[PDB]
């Protein structure tokens, strides 16, 4: 129904942890790079409690935060209540990018057609995860080696996989 590719963009753990107190549990800006290189010109689309700690529009990208608040507005954002809702503001996407927290991964679950995710070579203390994925006809496209040095203090590399369909 929908036509647009839905692709999650994530940096997760060796436990699948992607979140601790609200906020990320590690720093790392070379992976942000690819992060902001990956998704620029594309929507992101982002879990209310995601985008309050972000605390600001992300330049030259369609903001959209996913919500129940039917009050909700944010300036220079867009804002959808469900998974169709972001279908129809996206209708005409190329590409649209599911951008966390793991509530609204879950919410997307069913429709991701592409996965790209950053595995961190650590395990950390969080409270919030990156949902259990069958990837059974799904295959590895990319892989690389994230930068590791005295900035990037983790070893992680970046995966892509796409859904055989
Ligand atoms: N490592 C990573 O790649 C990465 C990426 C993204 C986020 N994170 C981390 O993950 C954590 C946040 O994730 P989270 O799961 O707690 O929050 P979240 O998924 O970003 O946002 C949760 C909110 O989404 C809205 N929502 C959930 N289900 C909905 C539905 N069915 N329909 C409409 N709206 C719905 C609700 O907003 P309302 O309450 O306003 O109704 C809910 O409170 C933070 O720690 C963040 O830093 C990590
Ligand atoms: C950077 C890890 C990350 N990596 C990957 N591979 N996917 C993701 N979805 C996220 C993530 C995230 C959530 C997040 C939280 C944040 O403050 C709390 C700021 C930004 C951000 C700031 C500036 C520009 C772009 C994004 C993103």
């Given at each position: ?19 601790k107190?609200?906020?990320l549990?590690?720093?790392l ?67 649209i ?16 057609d592409k ?10 203390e ?27 203090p ?9 859904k055989?369909?």
């Open positions: 129904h929908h036509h647009m590719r839905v692709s999650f963009m994530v940096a997760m753990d060796e436990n699948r942890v992607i979140g107190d609200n906020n549990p590690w720093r800006p070379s992976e942000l790079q690819y992060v902001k290189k990956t998704t620029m010109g594309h929507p992101l689309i982002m879990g209310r409690k995601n985008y309050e700690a972000i605390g600001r529009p992300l330049p030259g990208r369609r903001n959209i935060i996913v919500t129940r608040n039917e009050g909700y507005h944010v300036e220079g954002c867009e804002v959808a209540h469900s998974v169709e809702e972001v279908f129809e503001l996206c209708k005409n996407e190329e590409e990018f599911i951008f966390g927290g793991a509530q609204i991964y879950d919410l997307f679950l069913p429709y991701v996965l790209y995710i950053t595995k961190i070579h650590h395990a950390f969080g409270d919030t995860f990156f949902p259990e994925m069958d990837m059974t006809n799904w295959k590895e496209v990319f892989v690389e080696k994230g930068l590791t040095d005295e900035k990037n983790y070893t992680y590399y970046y995966h892509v996989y796409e055989q369909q």
